[PDB]
Amino acid sequence: SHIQRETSCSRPRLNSNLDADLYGYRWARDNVGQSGATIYRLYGKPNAPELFLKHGKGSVANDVTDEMVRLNWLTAFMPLPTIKHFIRTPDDAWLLTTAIPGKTAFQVLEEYPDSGENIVDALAVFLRRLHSIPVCNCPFNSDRVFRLAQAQSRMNNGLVDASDFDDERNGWPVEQVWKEMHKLLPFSPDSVVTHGDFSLDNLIFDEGKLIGCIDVGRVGIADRYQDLAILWNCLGEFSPSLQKRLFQKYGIDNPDMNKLQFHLMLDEFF
Numbered sequence: 464s465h466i467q468r469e470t471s472c473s474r475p476r477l478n479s480n481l482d483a484d485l486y487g488y489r490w491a492r493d494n495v496g497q498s499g500a501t502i503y504r505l506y507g508k509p510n511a512p513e514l515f516l517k518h519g520k521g522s523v524a525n526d527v528t529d530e531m532v533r534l535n536w537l538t539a540f541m542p543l544p545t546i547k548h549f550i551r552t553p554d555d556a557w558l559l560t561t562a563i564p565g566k567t568a569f570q571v572l573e574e575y576p577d578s579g580e581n582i583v584d585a586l587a588v589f590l591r592r593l594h595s596i597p598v599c600n601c602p603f604n605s606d607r608v609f610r611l612a613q614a615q616s617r618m619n620n621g622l623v624d625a626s627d628f629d630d631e632r633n634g635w636p637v638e639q640v641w642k643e644m645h646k647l648l649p650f651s652p653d654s655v656v657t658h659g660d661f662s663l664d665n666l667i668f669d670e671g672k673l674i675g676c677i678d679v680g681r682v683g684i685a686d687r688y689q690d691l692a693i694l695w696n697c698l699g700e701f702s703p704s705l706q707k708r709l710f711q712k713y714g715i716d717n718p719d720m721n722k723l724q725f726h727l728m729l730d731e732f733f
């Protein structure tokens with residue numbers, strides 16, 4: 464007809480890679496993470512901010528990819544690391560973000576046992592804020608039907624780490640956890656925007672203030688107990704008093720035991 468669908472041209476200028484940026488940085492390997500992704504802190508470069516590089520391989524590559532897009536979306540609502548560079552190849556994902564300065568909620572809870580109540584109060588406020596984001600803004604789905612189908616896949620592929628089961632399920636086969644979990648069903652969904660892994664090592668305090676969260680790969684719409692149960696579990700390692708204070712400050716007098724138990728068992732599959 465008139466104009467050709469495609470026009471022979473020359474090679475466009477490509478993007479500047481990691482090599483141009485990462486030069487001059489000192490490296491430190493993270494030992495905290497247990498997800499399989501390799502993680503490094505980049506520091507010691509004058510006039511440059513500290514960074515984190517998270518590298519996922521195989522199935523973990525998908526996990527890091529999921530983290531990147533949820534990081535990209537949620538950043539408009541909550542304080543998150545800034546995406547500096549992301550690369551996806553068929554079996555690899557590299558995520559370079561800004562470091563959030565300070566210590567995790569877990570660290571400050573150990574280093575300062577007397578600041579426990581204050582820490583919990585901040586966590587509750589942060590959580591109320593996260594759960595106040597209008598659901599209509601969230602492009603990500605993390606409801607129980609979705610997570611369960613996901614959990615079943617991880618089970619059938621022998622990926623579920625039984626050594627990470629809670630004390631109550633020490634020695635249980637993954638099949639028994641799966642079976643018993645369904646006996647708690649059903650329950651009425653209370654859908655909000657959730658974090659997916661609202662644990663003490665994912666929340667960072669700096670100078671007496673919670674200034675951000677990380678590890679946002681499971682962000683999406685789910686029951687509010689998806690975040691509550693996990694944080695409640697983490698606090699149990701410290702004190703039942705703090706657990707109680709979390710719910711009090713969040714706005715719930717008495718925890719829904721069934722909803723609490725379901726999400727705690729669900730988390731065993733991930």
Ligand SMILES: Nc1ncnc2c1ncn2[C@@H]1O[C@H](COP(=O)(O)OP(=O)(O)OP(=O)(O)O)[C@@H](O)[C@H]1O
Pocket residue numbers: 493495496497498499500502515517544560561562563564567664665667677678
């Ligand atoms: N952007 C960041 N800012 C500050 N600290 C970070 C950042 N990214 C990672 N870290 C540090 O590295 C640790 C591991 O990070 P992350 O939780 O993403 O790894 P993971 O393998 O998913 O860990 P987990 O086994 O808890 O899932 C964190 O506990 C945190 O201390």
Ligand SMILES: [Ca+2]
Pocket residue numbers: 492493494495496500501502
């Ligand atoms: Ca590591």
Ligand SMILES: [Ca+2]
Pocket residue numbers: 496664665678
């Ligand atoms: Ca983590």
Ligand SMILES: [Ca+2]
Pocket residue numbers: 498660678
């Ligand atoms: Ca993680």
Ligand SMILES: [Ca+2]
Pocket residue numbers: 627628629730731
């Ligand atoms: Ca577990």
